[PDB]
Amino acid sequence: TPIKQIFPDDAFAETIKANLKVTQNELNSIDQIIANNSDIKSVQGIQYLPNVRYLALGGNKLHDISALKELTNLTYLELKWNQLQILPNGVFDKLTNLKELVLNSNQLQSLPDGVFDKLTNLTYLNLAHNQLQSLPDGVFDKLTNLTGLELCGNQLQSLPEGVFDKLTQLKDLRLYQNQLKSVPDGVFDRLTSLQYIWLHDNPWDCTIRYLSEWINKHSGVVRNSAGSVAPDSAKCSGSGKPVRSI
Amino acid sequence: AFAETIKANLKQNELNSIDQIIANNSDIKSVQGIQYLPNVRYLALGGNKLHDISALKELTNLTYLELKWNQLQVFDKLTNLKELVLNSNQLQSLPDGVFDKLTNLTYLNLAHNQLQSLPDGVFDKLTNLTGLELCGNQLQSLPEGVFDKLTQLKDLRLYQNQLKSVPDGVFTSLQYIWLHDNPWGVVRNSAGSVAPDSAKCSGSGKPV
Amino acid sequence: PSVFLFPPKPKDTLMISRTPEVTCVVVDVEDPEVKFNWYVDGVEVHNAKTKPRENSTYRVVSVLTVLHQDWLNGKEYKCKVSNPAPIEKTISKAKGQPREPQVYTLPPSRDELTKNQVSLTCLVKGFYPSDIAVEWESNGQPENNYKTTPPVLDSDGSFFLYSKLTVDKSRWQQGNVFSCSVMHEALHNHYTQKSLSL
Amino acid sequence: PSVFLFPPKPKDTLMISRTPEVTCVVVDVSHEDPEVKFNWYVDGVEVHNAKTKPREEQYNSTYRVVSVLTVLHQDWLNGKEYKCKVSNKALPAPIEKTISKAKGQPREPQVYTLPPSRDELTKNQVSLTCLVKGFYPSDIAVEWESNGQPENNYKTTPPVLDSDGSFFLYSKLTVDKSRWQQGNVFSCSVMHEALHNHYTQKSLSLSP
Numbered sequence: 001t002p003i004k005q006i007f008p009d010d011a012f013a014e015t016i017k018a019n020l021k022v023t024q025n026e027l028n029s030i031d032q033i034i035a036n037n038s039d040i041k042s043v044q045g046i047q048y049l050p051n052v053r054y055l056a057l058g059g060n061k062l063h064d065i066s067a068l069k070e071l072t073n074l075t076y077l078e079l080k081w082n083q084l085q086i087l088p089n090g091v092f093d094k095l096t097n098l099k100e101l102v103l104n105s106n107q108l109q110s111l112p113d114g115v116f117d118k119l120t121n122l123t124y125l126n127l128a129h130n131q132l133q134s135l136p137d138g139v140f141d142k143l144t145n146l147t148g149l150e151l152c153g154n155q156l157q158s159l160p161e162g163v164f165d166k167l168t169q170l171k172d173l174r175l176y177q178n179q180l181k182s183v184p185d186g187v188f189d190r191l192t193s194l195q196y197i198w199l200h201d202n203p204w205d206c207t208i209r210y211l212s213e214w215i216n217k218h219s220g221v222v223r224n225s226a227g228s229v230a231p232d233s234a235k236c237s238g239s240g241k242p243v244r245s246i
Numbered sequence: 247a248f249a250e251t252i253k254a255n256l257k258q259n260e261l262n263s264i265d266q267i268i269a270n271n272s273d274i275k276s277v278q279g280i281q282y283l284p285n286v287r288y289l290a291l292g293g294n295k296l297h298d299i300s301a302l303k304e305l306t307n308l309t310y311l312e313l314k315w316n317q318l319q320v321f322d323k324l325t326n327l328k329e330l331v332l333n334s335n336q337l338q339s340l341p342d343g344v345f346d347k348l349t350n351l352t353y354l355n356l357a358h359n360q361l362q363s364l365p366d367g368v369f370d371k372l373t374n375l376t377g378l379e380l381c382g383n384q385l386q387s388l389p390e391g392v393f394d395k396l397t398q399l400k401d402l403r404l405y406q407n408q409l410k411s412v413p414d415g416v417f418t419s420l421q422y423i424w425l426h427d428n429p430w431g432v433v434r435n436s437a438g439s440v441a442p443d444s445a446k447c448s449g450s451g452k453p454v
Numbered sequence: 455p456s457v458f459l460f461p462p463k464p465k466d467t468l469m470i471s472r473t474p475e476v477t478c479v480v481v482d483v484e485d486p487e488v489k490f491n492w493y494v495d496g497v498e499v500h501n502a503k504t505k506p507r508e509n510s511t512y513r514v515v516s517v518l519t520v521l522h523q524d525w526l527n528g529k530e531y532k533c534k535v536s537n538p539a540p541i542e543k544t545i546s547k548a549k550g551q552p553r554e555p556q557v558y559t560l561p562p563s564r565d566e567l568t569k570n571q572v573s574l575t576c577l578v579k580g581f582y583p584s585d586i587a588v589e590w591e592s593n594g595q596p597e598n599n600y601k602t603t604p605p606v607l608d609s610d611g612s613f614f615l616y617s618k619l620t621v622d623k624s625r626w627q628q629g630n631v632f633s634c635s636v637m638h639e640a641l642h643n644h645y646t647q648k649s650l651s652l
Numbered sequence: 653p654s655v656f657l658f659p660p661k662p663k664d665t666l667m668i669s670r671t672p673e674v675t676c677v678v679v680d681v682s683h684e685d686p687e688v689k690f691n692w693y694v695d696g697v698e699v700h701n702a703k704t705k706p707r708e709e710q711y712n713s714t715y716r717v718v719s720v721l722t723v724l725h726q727d728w729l730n731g732k733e734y735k736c737k738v739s740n741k742a743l744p745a746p747i748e749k750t751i752s753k754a755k756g757q758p759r760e761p762q763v764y765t766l767p768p769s770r771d772e773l774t775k776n777q778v779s780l781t782c783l784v785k786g787f788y789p790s791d792i793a794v795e796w797e798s799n800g801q802p803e804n805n806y807k808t809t810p811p812v813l814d815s816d817g818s819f820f821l822y823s824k825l826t827v828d829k830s831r832w833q834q835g836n837v838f839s840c841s842v843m844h845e846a847l848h849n850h851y852t853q854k855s856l857s858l859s860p
């Protein structure tokens with residue numbers, strides 16, 4: 001088959017024409033694809049390259065990622081800034097070799113229960129600056145190897161209790177720029193390896209005695225938007241006074 | 247002026263630790279003080295406005311002397327000199343045998359000055375010379391035997407001068423000679439190519 | 455009005471004890487006043503600096519601090535200058551699947567042991583991307599008489615380099631043990647240390 | 653309307669078997685006036701031996717016209733200064749740029765081959781490294797060869813400024829662990845101006 005016949009997306013043909021500079025043995029020689037900000041609409045045909053391990057698809061206009069369901073040798077998946085709207089269920093269940101998943105700045109409205117649960121090898125998950133209002137109960141519980149979790153810039157109304165249960169290896173948790181009023185008691189008490197937490201720019205209801213006590217105990221993992229260590233950055237709603245000061 | 251080269255070279259005993267001075271296309275008129283730093287070896291002075299090199303007559307250990315484009319119009323005491331660059335000056339002659347002491351010299355560039363004469367025996371006292379440049383002068387006297395005491399010479403440039411003939415017999419190491427623009431496999435042309443017919447007979451322009 | 459974007463120093467993204475930063479640089483530009491907006495991953499930030507200004511060279515610079523592991527994670531940094539219309543430019547860590555560097559240490563040529571000081575060399579081949587740190591150290595303290603060549607693209611599409619540490623042959627021949635330390639994203643703990651002695 | 657002046661390749665100027673050239677590139681010459689006039693001056697004297705290439709448009713919808721000039725013999729090594737001057741309608745005064753070999757006293761490179769790390773003999777392919785240290789200027793050329801005929805599977809590091817002002821670099825030749833172990837003798841050849849005959853060749857192999 002020619003370049004034009006396997007891939008109906010103009011841009012996606014242009015990137016498979018650039019990678020190889022075709023035979024199925026040729027198509028089975030493709031280990032990575034770098035095709036970011038390349039004006040791409042659908043990856044129809046990406047199912048015939050089962051040995052691809054690295055996939056750079058950020059900055060494109062994807063709606064459906066259905067054709068990646070079986071690519072079982074993937075480990076890096078970067079889909080930052082596309083047009084994804086909701087996440088089909090089980091679509092990640094087969095990517096059990098993923099270590100890093102970047103769903104940065106899409107239009108995702110919600111997460112189905114247990115969509116990540118077949119990704120036990122993940123260390124990095126970027127869901128920041130989407131449109132999430134809430135999170136499936138213990139969605140982050142099969143994700144035991146998770147070193148960084150980014151959620152900032154959403155409209156998160158509230159966090160499930162123990163939602164961060166099986167995340168001992170977590171070192172970086174990002175929550176700033178959310179519509180958070182309070183956190184479950186003992187949501188963070190198991191986050192043992194946590195070295196960076198981001199909590200500023202949240203309407204902290206200080207009506208707030210667990211978080212006020214968790215921050216003083218860990219008065220060195222909180223960082224403001226500039227990077228400097230700064231625990232007075234989580235400000236109470238209305239008053240504007242720092243949380244840790246109550 | 248000259249001091250800012252020193253202030254940049256040295257970012258007393260301090261002038262002794264200066265072996266090389268790189269300071270070309272500056273605005274230097276005097277080089278005075280250049281005797282107060284003896285252990286100095288490399289000297290680059292191209293693009294200044296000098297006329298005296300009196301201050302240098304006693305830098306005995308220097309091995310490179312670059313004097314391109316200066317207003318020159320002394321060498322006996324720096325025998326370790328190896329490469330002496332003296333093109334684009336205005337010098338109208340050359341003292342009768344000031345190249346005799348520096349036996350170790352190997353590159354002499356006298357191109358584009360103003361030499362109608364050549365003191366006989368000035369070239370005979372430096373056998374290991376590799377290149378010699380006399381192009382762009384007022385040459386008209388090419389003294390005889392002058393290139394005979396020069397065996398290791400590989401480049402000898404005589405283009406753009408006023409020679410009407412040569413003592414036949416003045417010309418083994420030699421691979422490159424230049425004879426063009428004069429109005430009478432080792433010869434080349436100004437464009438870098440073995441070109442034996444580039445020696446055109448005056449007026450008739452007939453190669454010979 | 456020419457604008458450029460320069461990535462943080464690998465020594466800073468891998469040592470973490472240091473603050474990395476991305477340096478935006480505008481030259482050419484009478485009107486030496488330029489507003490700088492910054493964006494990480496498509497979202498505007500305001501934490502950036504600006505240094506005092508500097509042919510009549512308009513070397514006005516804005517530096518922006520890297521948060522934690524944002525660089526290695528693959529965040530994209532965009533600088534936006536204004537007076538023309540706004541000129542935007544983006545910079546990001548090199549895309550492609552990382553590869554772990556091999557580090558081998560290589561003692562001085564016998565023929566060099568005739569000179570007041572010898573050369574110890576550290577060969578680091580086959581890493582990706584080229585972002586990498588290399589340093590030397592002896593018995594607990596660090597050395598400092600070393601130079602490291604820049605990454606070089608290799609036949610297999612990865613990088614290599616060498617660091618040459620220079621010590622007094624009296625110090626090599628005594629049997630002292632020097633250590634080449636190397637910091638890259640594809641190394642466990644971002645870190646490996648190789649040693650060599652007589 | 654911008655000009656860029658590249659030097660000759662070291663490989664050309666140290667082999668002379670190959671023909672060195674100094675290239676003057678101009679880009680952004682379009683449309684309006686596509687007329688460029690190069691003037692060349694070697695050591696300050698204008699010269700007319702430059703054959704100019706035909707102009708060439710690119711997807712920038714602008715022109716990039718090249719002039720190339722031949723280097724007469726050791727002129728680059730001897731320190732000749734090459735100046736390019738472009739005149740186009742699209743700018744006030746003509747543009748000028750001079751290029752010349754780096755000033756500073758020449759220093760001989762030291763050349764040392766290094767056999768593979770023991771931990772590298774646990775692999776299919778080993779690295780033979782060449783250490784060239786202590787040369788000036790940077791103009792240098794490095795090659796590898798096995799049994800008289802050449803090896804073509806090495807990458808060379810660009811010259812690096814060392815703590816004493818000289819340069820150094822490494823050359824990594826990759827080979828099969830078997831060729832190394834069978835006891836073949838490989839060579840790192842080096843071409844530089846401060847070398848006798850501008851050449852040196854160091855060899856490495858294992859003998860039990």
Ligand SMILES: *[C@@H]1O[C@H](CO[C@@H]2O[C@@H](C)[C@@H](O)[C@@H](O)[C@@H]2O)[C@@H](O[C@@H]2O[C@H](CO)[C@@H](O[C@@H]3O[C@H](CO[C@H]4O[C@H](CO)[C@@H](O)[C@H](O)[C@@H]4O[C@@H]4O[C@H](CO)[C@@H](O)[C@H](O)[C@H]4NC(C)=O)[C@@H](O)[C@H](O[C@H]4O[C@H](CO)[C@@H](O)[C@H](O)[C@@H]4O[C@@H]4O[C@H](CO)[C@@H](O)[C@H](O)[C@H]4NC(C)=O)[C@@H]3O)[C@H](O)[C@H]2NC(C)=O)[C@H](O)[C@H]1NC(C)=O
Nearest residue numbers: 456458459460461462463477479481482509510511512513
């Ligand atoms: C008025 O003069 C000033 C400055 O004068 C200068 O200094 C004096 C003393 C004299 O020497 C002058 O002759 C000289 O001009 C002019 O200002 C210059 O403007 C030019 C562009 O016009 C800049 O060129 C860029 O330089 C970068 C690299 O910059 C680093 O290295 C330079 C030296 O090599 C140095 O100048 C820089 O300061 C800088 O040094 C590094 O900077 C960081 C930040 O501090 C630091 O962490 C590093 O440690 C440090 N490293 C050092 C010192 O070693 C170069 O990469 C740029 O090239 C890109 O774009 C080009 C288009 O012009 C193109 O040729 C290239 O292909 C390249 O394109 C990019 O390539 C890379 C790699 O692939 C990649 O990013 C992309 O592929 C691609 N991106 C694209 C296309 O977008 C560029 O050449 C000068 O740096 C700057 N001089 C200084 C000191 O800043 C001024 O222009 C004059 N005014 C005029 C003519 O009108």
Ligand SMILES: *[C@@H]1O[C@H](CO[C@@H]2O[C@@H](C)[C@@H](O)[C@@H](O)[C@@H]2O)[C@@H](O[C@@H]2O[C@H](CO)[C@@H](O[C@@H]3O[C@H](CO[C@H]4O[C@H](CO)[C@@H](O)[C@H](O)[C@@H]4O[C@@H]4O[C@H](CO)[C@@H](O)[C@H](O)[C@H]4NC(C)=O)[C@@H](O)[C@H](O[C@H]4O[C@H](CO)[C@@H](O)[C@H](O)[C@@H]4O[C@@H]4O[C@H](CO)[C@@H](O)[C@H](O)[C@H]4NC(C)=O)[C@@H]3O)[C@H](O)[C@H]2NC(C)=O)[C@H](O)[C@H]1NC(C)=O
Nearest residue numbers: 654656658659661675677679680710712713714716718749
């Ligand atoms: C539109 O048209 C063209 C084409 O666009 C280009 O081509 C296409 C295919 C795409 O790739 C595009 O991405 C690309 O933009 C544009 O033309 C370009 O314009 C820029 C600057 O305006 C030029 O950059 C300068 O070039 C030299 C290096 O150029 C060599 O290396 C390139 C790749 O590495 C190669 O592409 C070039 O062809 C060129 O190749 C060499 O050519 C010779 C002989 O032909 C050969 O012998 C060489 O071996 C070969 N080298 C190779 C292959 O590697 C670079 O050195 C310049 O940097 C100096 O000047 C800067 C000022 O801008 C300054 O910042 C730098 O620091 C540095 O300054 C000098 O540095 C040294 C020591 O540090 C010293 O002399 C001085 O301090 C200082 N001197 C100064 C300032 O004068 C610089 O990067 C591109 O070459 C040029 N591309 C081509 C193909 O010509 C054009 O700009 C576009 N115009 C528009 C949009 O309007």
